[PDB]
Design a protein around this ligand. Structure first.
Ligand SMILES: CC(=O)N[C@H]1[C@H](OC[C@H]2O[C@H](OP(=O)(O)O)[C@H](NC(C)=O)[C@@H](O)[C@@H]2O)O[C@H](CO[C@]2(C(=O)O)C[C@@H](O[C@]3(C(=O)O)C[C@@H](O)[C@@H](O)[C@@H]([C@H](O)CO)O3)[C@@H](O)[C@@H]([C@H](O)CO)O2)[C@@H](OP(=O)(O)O)[C@@H]1O
Ligand SMILES: C[C@H](C[C@@H]1O[C@H]([C@@H](O)CO)[C@@H](O)[C@H](O)[C@@H]1O)OP(=O)(O)OC[C@H]1O[C@@H](n2cnc3c(N)ncnc32)[C@H](O)[C@@H]1O
Length: 322
């Protein structure tokens, strides 16, 4: 049995799909998945043992010059790579018109996705052969597991979802695995950042432990913030630019992580690393992290400026006390 997954974006949503593959592999021996994913996240699906051919799309990049000749050629090539196999099922776990119309509609095989009432964009449901009702108010992980279970004809297991990607990293753990924490400071929107002074106070409060701290970055403004945080603290290292796989290796070796609500926090969750996520204006309810040792630190009044470094250190201490 060969299944095509359509689940293109964003980073966390791609990661959240992994436990559904693991469920399906256990219920259907020898099932294999191809996966249409945005090019920036193409590495993620390759880490799961049930995945064969990743089929990158670049919808977001194509939209700037959609009819430009090189773009028309990439689109053409994408359709050809999409239509190369006949799939036993095509599962659209995204539920957007972009995903349904630009990708799912063109693939060969029976097309499964969410119905009018449960899809993110209801009109996406017009493009499916098999519509499934997947209740909106559950964690993203559980929704996708339910969609896979209903699409492929097996009962949704009651056990906790298993991403099954940490084994891929078992063979490549950094040498200094266990001797550092990773601080994930970069996110999407000003009010979701923990103010810089609070990070630096936290870092300061860990002078006395002798722990090492590593700071990733994936764009210029993030590099500069990483440098301001590390300034004056010899136990803090600013990582060089790396691939998504590289930063995953780093996270896989971390004793623990402290993070804002961000893509790489969900990657941390997918790798089962202890993670303290700091939330203000976003609700850890449904798009909180799902996994082992994902801890939730709620800023007073939902405002991150009000959450002190002391309160976070104490939260770490209270949680280790297990
Ligand atoms: C037409 C349009 O704008 N489509 C874009 C869309 O969103 C749907 C919806 O957005 C608004 O409605 P809301 O009121 O905000 O619900 C618009 N209305 C108004 C009044 O502004 C409507 O026109 C639209 O129908 O957003 C996409 C970005 O979404 C993703 C992504 O798939 O890439 C997914 C986001 O994830 C969630 C979510 O919060 O909605 C939750 C997950 O658990 C999943 O359930 C997932 C779902 O399967 C859909 O994929 O959605 C989130 O992760 C975001 C990122 O934060 C954004 O960076 O990414 C748009 O895709 P693009 O970013 O343009 O590629 C889509 O074009
Ligand atoms: C990973 C992705 C890369 C971009 O992908 C685009 C598309 O395929 C997906 O939209 C392409 O159009 C584009 O060519 C480019 O490859 O960025 P992101 O979703 O914004 O990453 C979200 C956040 O996660 C961080 N991040 C993402 N990759 C990171 C890395 N290798 N090291 C450190 N941080 C990293 C970023 O800095 C952000 O804060």
């Amino acid at each position: 049995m060969r299944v095509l997954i359509v689940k293109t974006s964003s980073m966390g949503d791609v990661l959240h799909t992994l436990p559904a593959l693991t469920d399906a592999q256990q219920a259907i021996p020898g099932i294999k998945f191809d996966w249409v994913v945005e090019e920036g996240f193409a590495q993620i699906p390759s880490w799961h043992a049930a995945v064969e051919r990743v089929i990158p799309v670049a919808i977001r990049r194509w939209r700037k010059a959609w009819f430009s000749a090189p773009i028309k050629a990439e689109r053409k090539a994408f359709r050809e790579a999409l239509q190369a196999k006949n799939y036993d099922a095509v599962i659209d776990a995204q539920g957007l018109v972009k995903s349904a119309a630009l990708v799912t509609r063109l693939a060969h095989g029976v097309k499964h996705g969410m119905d009018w009432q449960t899809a993110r964009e209801p009109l996406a449901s017009l493009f499916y052969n098999r519509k499934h009702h997947i209740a909106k108010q559950q964690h993203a992980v559980e929704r996708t597991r339910e969609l896979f279970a209903k699409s492929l004809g097996y009962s949704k297991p009651q056990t906790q979802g298993d991403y099954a990607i940490a084994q891929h990293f078992l063979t490549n753990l950094p040498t200094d695995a266990g001797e550092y924490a990773v601080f994930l400071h970069a996110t999407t929107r000003d009010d979701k950042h923990w103010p810089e002074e609070h990070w630096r106070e936290l870092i300061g409060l860990l002078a006395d432990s002798g722990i090492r701290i590593k700071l990733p970055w994936g764009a210029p403004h993030e590099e500069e913030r990483a440098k301001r945080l590390a300034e004056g603290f010899a136990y803090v290292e600013v990582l060089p630019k790396m691939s998504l796989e590289g930063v995953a290796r780093v996270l896989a070796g971390a004793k623990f992580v402290v993070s804002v609500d961000t893509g790489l926090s969900h990657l941390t969750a997918a790798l089962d690393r202890p993670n303290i996520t700091v939330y203000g204006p976003t609700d850890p309810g449904l798009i909180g992290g799902y996994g082992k040792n994902q801890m939730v630190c709620r800023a007073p009044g939902n405002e991150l400026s009000q959450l002190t470094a002391n309160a976070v250190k104490q939260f770490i201490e209270e949680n280790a006390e297990k």
